[PDB]
Structure 1
């Protein structure tokens, strides 16, 4: 009855969440060999382009393509940069950057609904047909995170891997690894306990690793294949939830028991036949890239601590 906790999220891999913003190739982004990406605040830039060469700077900003990330703040006279919001480190190996969820004060935070949906996917490993009218999650109350600092962010570039680590032109400002994120979570003990959470989380992670991830890891292990080695059997303590920073289809879907290869072939047919080109099982996973050398960490995997009150 009303067991309040303190869920502490420690990001092992990169954590990215939501945002509703798609920052373009030229829109407020500058990266060079000093490896920072300043984001310029929104309306101050155009109200400062009000007071100097208005139509000229509008024409320059539309017709300086295919180059505006550094080109028009270096050969025009916009070399001064006081219009930043914050700096963030980057990761190569080109544009359309996505954005971490912020409040109106601009501090990043994790909404409690994302963690609740992640825990819902963790609990629904058993009873996959847990219906529209569920009664467990009217009592499982999750709350908002602490507004974490602006130095736990670093811009990553995602990579997908079947036979070579193919670069993709998607940039997302994720969280740094080993970032401590403080929540609070409450529920009634008639329907769920913390031990139920722990065995459900462990069941979800072991069913994700076995029979789709490790069975596709024993295949296609090459000189770019092998921090990131196993991370399951060392300590099962400090369990893992995935927060949806592009984790993939397998993390979101959950019809596991007892489908071992039926799951793989149905997933392949469902994803491939309706969207894009058709290949063999398995399709791919999604690590990240950060140089010098790319480290290949999996997105969303984190650590979980529960302490009472």
Structure 2
């Protein structure tokens, strides 16, 4: 069928998709086009749908048969007045601005995408249930322990957004929203899998153990919002 969609992202948090050209001043730069006008490349959305569908064992290989057909294009190109400076804060305990800043996209930015995919193995029947599955396990596998354990009253304007819509089609794109948003294997147990990836992570660095690892929300610059970043809403309409 080649069912094309016009999906649109609205930003619940500050977002910074890599860039490569990146340097208390710490002046940063972002991915732009050749006209100096920012946009979001389609590989970010393809990685987000890789988190969505391929949440399984390590078969994410050149032998793959699903994601050669998922034809994600780029977006429309938005001017640079949709951009404010923001800060990095780690909400584990005693939340303080860490010295690692970024010039990033302003929240609630309307960006739209010409996303299409073939129907040989790919439908929205898969996308809907896979996104609800990944969202529900993003709470019940990692963030439920962050809700019940080592929780401070500063974070609870914050939207828990679980009674809102169970078919909300929510993804996570990689924008420095912790090293939990760049995962692939959460199936299907709670704490044995947690300690599994805990030694898998802690043989790559030197931290003393504590639960839970690293949750990175953000806020607004007195009005406060405690806006978690990395997540966005998607609509699915044809053409």
Give the alignment's TM-score, normalised by structure 1: 0.72
Alignment partner of 2:52: what SS?
Answer: helix
- Matches of 1:97 and 1:295, distance apart in 2: 25
d(CA) in 2 for partners of 1:212 and 1:242? 14
Q: How many residues align?
A: 239
> Structure 2 regions of 5+ residues with no counterpart?
none
CA distance in structure 1 between the aligned counterparts of 2:132 and 2:30, rounded to whole angstroms: 28
1:287 aligned onto 2:217: yes
- Deviations for 1:224-268, whole angstroms, at most 9, x for unmatched residues? 232534122222343211111112222222211113102211222
Contact 1:289 1:296 in 2 (8 A): yes
Q: Secondary structure at the match of 1:215?
A: helix
CA distance in 1, matches of 2:87, 2:174: 16
- Distance in 2 (CA, whole Å) between partners of 1:234 and 1:262 is 30
| Structure whose alpha-carbon radius of gyration is higher | 1
* Post-superposition offset of 1:144: 0.6
Query: Does the aligned pair in 2 maintain the 1:97–1:170 contact within 8 Å?
Result: no
* TM-score under structure 2 length normalisation: 0.92
How far 1:306 sits from its partner (Å)?
1.2
Instruction: Classify the secondary structure of the residue corresponding to 2:228.
Output: coil
CA deviations on 1:6-58 (whole Å, 9 max, x unpaired) are 111111222211222234xxxxxxxxxxxxxxxxxxxxxxxxxxxxxxxxxxx
Alpha-carbon distance in structure 1 between the residues aligned to 2:170 and 2:81? 23
Shift of 1:122: 0.9
| Aligned-pair Cα RMSD in Å | 1.8
Q: Distance in 2 between matches of 1:236 and 1:258?
A: 20
Q: Is the 8 A contact 1:156 1:171 kept in 2?
A: yes
Q: Assess if the C-alpha contact under 8 Å between 2:14 and 2:229 holds in 1.
A: yes
Secondary structure at the counterpart of residue 204 of structure 2: helix
* Contact 1:16/1:243 (<8 A) preserved: no
